Amino acid sequence: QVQLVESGGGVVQPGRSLRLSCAASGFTFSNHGMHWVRQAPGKRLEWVAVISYDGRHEHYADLVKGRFTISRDNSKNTLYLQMNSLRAEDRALYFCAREGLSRDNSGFTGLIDYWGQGTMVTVSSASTKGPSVFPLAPSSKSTSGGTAALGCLVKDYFPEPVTVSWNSGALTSGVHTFPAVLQSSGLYSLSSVVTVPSSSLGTQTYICNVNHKPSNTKVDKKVEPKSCD
Amino acid sequence: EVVLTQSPATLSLSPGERATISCRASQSVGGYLTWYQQKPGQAPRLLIYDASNRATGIPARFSGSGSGTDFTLTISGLEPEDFAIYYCQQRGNWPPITFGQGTRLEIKRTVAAPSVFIFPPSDEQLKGTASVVCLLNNFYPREAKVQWKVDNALQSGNSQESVTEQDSKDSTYSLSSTLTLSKADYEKHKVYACEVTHQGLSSPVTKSFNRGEC
């Protein structure tokens, strides 16, 4: 019944600050040392900091020394991570993790045994913005041996995420929505495609339903076949 | 700091087989080695600690061994739920606490060359930027490369690619590459080609179109 729930994650401007929280329950918080570990999307795990059970001692990764501060309030079973002078490379999912008890009820163990699901931190100065949705129409150039590919380009939005469904959710088979990609403009972009029988292009309409809740914008783009040559 | 090097970087196996993952340290850490399992959109899960001790609920098919600088995570009789990323972590000499770079255990299936499709910019998008998309669909293995050429000039720094997670049903992957140009530059050239390199293809496959063709 061990629980670790992080919060505080969000978008922060480069150079500004953000404080993360981690509410613990299901175990005796004041007896365990606690850690913060981060991980950039699709990247490796990187230890950030650790603090003793009584808050008397802390240790930090060289990349965050002098910028981050780990602390705790045992009276409320809460762990904190004060992040200052944030940089683009600090973007990542931040996990608060528990480490096992020590032989002597005093030293560190480094035996991280329970992890929270994390809180996302994004460092950018980009303004919230809904996406522009462009059709990736099926044509001779996107149709091979009885199969036609079509999709939607969900471009220039911030921040993540966007959700894409096809034909109001009725079309799920053959659908591939790719991981968003960060453009040099600071805005995200992603593509959602689907392959269907060429024989259906004249009897079935295709529409991608895009939703960007941070900007509360909805866009339904019709994707129609094109002639070629 | 203790550098942890896992090997191989990616393991391709199928249910019922045995997975052997190594973790080597730059210096001795005794038996202070931990193994984690991490599935996409999920936090790491403790599997084994102290090199060979399985955590509560972890099935006997998982076994850790080794000492000093060489450790091994062995998974006998692989099951569908075992396909994920594995990380080793040392607590022998810290701070800093260090992790391995991770090992991707994926499902092996027979090679499948990608179906290649190319999409010119939409008329709507043309009304100051032009995006050209190349889709590599349902292929295996995951390694795939896309090269862009405009009027036969190799393109550099103006494209981005993305890959899907391994399909749960057909065990394939899909990749999409986008070439972004200024409308001026797009109107400037004629031929747009997407060159694909994948082992399912004996030689690179080129997919192209002329501006205003479709």
The string of DSSP letters for B173-214 reads EEEEEEEEEEHHHHHH--EEEEEEE-TTSSS-EEEEEETT--
Number of Cβ within 10 Å of residue A13's Cβ equals: 12
Residue type, A133: V
Whether A151 has its CB under 8 Å from any CB of chain B: the answer is yes
For residue A28, give the amino acid letter. Answer: T
Q: Are A159 and A212 in contact (CB under 8 A)?
A: no
Resolution stated for this PDB structure, in Å: 1.7
- Token pair, residue B128, equals 């100051």
Q: Are B139 and B172 in contact (CB under 8 A)?
A: yes
B208 and B162 assigned to the same domain: yes
CA distance A227 to chain B (A): 6
B131 touches A: beta carbon within 8 Å: yes
Specify whether B105 is located in the same domain as B67: yes
One domain, residues B124 and B80: no
> Which of A125, A141, A169 lies at the terminal end of a domain, its last residue?
A125
Experimental technique: X-ray
Cβ contacts of residue A204 below 8 Å, gap of 6+?
A196
> Chain A within 8 Å of B8 (Cβ-Cβ)?
no
Clarify whether residues B144 and B181 are in a common domain.
Answer: yes
3-state helix, strand, coil in chain A (%, to 5): 10, 50, 40
Largest Cα–Cα distance of chain B, in whole Å?
66
Strands A10-12 and A68-73: unpaired
Count of the separate structural domains present in chain B: 2
Tell me the β-bridge partners of A5: A23
Q: Which residues in chain A touch residue B96, judged by CB atoms under 8 angstroms apart?
A: 47, 59, 61-62
Residues A11 and A46 in one domain: yes
The DSSP output letter for B23 is E
Q: Which amino acid is at A164?
A: V
Q: Which of the residues A103, A113, A136 would you substitute to probe the B interface, choosing the one with the greatest number of B C-beta atoms within 10 Å?
A: A136
**Chain A from 179 to 218: CB within 8 A of any B CB:** 179-181, 183, 189-191, 193, 195
- Contact list, B163 vs chain A (CB under 8 Å): 178-179
How far apart (Å, rounded) are the C-alpha atoms in residues B25 and B69?
5
Question: Are B115 and B70 found together in one domain?
Answer: no
Q: Which domain holds residue B206?
A: 110-214
Burial A111-128 (b: 16+ CB within 10 A, else e): bbbbbbebbbbbbbebee
Residues of chain A found within 8 Å of residue B84, distances taken between Cβ atoms: none
Tokens of B164: 């899907």
Q: What are phi and psi of B147, to 5 degrees?
A: -125, 135
With an 8 Å Cβ cutoff, are B97 and A135 in contact? no
Q: Report CA B173 to chain centroid distance, whole Å.
A: 10
Asked if B174's CB is within 8 angstroms of A191's CB, the reply is: no
How far is the alpha carbon of B17 from chain A, nearest alpha carbon, in Å? 26
Residues A75 and A150 in one domain: no
For B193, other C-beta atoms within 10 Å of its C-beta total 19
CA of A170, closest CA in chain B: separation in Å?
A: 19
Q: Do B132 and B61 share a domain, yes or no?
A: no
Q: Would the CB atoms of A115 and B44 count as touching at under 8 Å?
A: yes
Residues 6+ apart with CB under 8 A from A25: A1, A2, A3, A77
Please tell me what DSSP assigns to residue A159. S
Report yes or no: B36 and B98 within 8 Å, Cβ to Cβ.
no
Q: Are residues A140 and A112 in the same domain?
A: no
B71 and B164 share a domain?
no
Strand partners, A89: none
The span from the CA of B52 to the CA of B91, in Å, is 14
Length, in residues, of chain B: 214
Closest by CA to A45, choosing from A100, A118, A99, is A118
Query: Residue A170 corresponds to which tokens in the numbers above?
Result: 């009725």
- What's the CA angle centered on B12, arms B8 and B15, to 5 degrees? 130
Task: Measure CA A117 to chain center.
Answer: 11
Distance separating alpha carbons of residues B4 and B34, to the nearest angstrom: 11
A121 & A47 share domain: yes
The boundaries of the domain holding residue A71 are 1-125
Both structure tokens of B47: 């599997």
Token digits of residue A56 = 């008397």
Residues of B in contact with A37 (CB under 8 A): 97
**Pairing status of strand B53-54 against strand B45-49:** antiparallel
How far, in Å, CA of B112 to CA of B172, rounded? 8
A75: left (phi over 0), alpha (psi -120 to 50) or beta: alpha
Cβ neighbours for A115, distance < 8 A, ≥ 6 positions apart? A4, A37, A95, A96, A97, A98, B43, B44, B45
Q: Are residues A94 and A172 in the same domain?
A: no
- Residue A49's H or E segment, with its range, is strand A45-51
